[PDB]
Amino acid sequence: EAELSAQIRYLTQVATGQPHEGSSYSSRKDCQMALKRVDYARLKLSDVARTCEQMLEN
């Protein structure tokens, strides 16, 4: 009973009844952009690799 009563008092000092409109969306978009930029790079590199591979072989 001691612990629950203390917890209720703590909630009575931290409650305000508003939705708290912070968030973390922008940095997550930026990081996703960077990952797909790296993927583009990896695709083009593989293509160059295969054309050089086929020229070296005759």
Partner: peptide, 27 residues
Amino acid sequence: NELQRKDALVQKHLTKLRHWQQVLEDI
């Protein structure tokens, strides 16, 4: 002689290309 020069240089580009391909794939 210039034929061998071209072959060696394109081989060097391919080796480094494979190296950086694996470096970027390790992410």
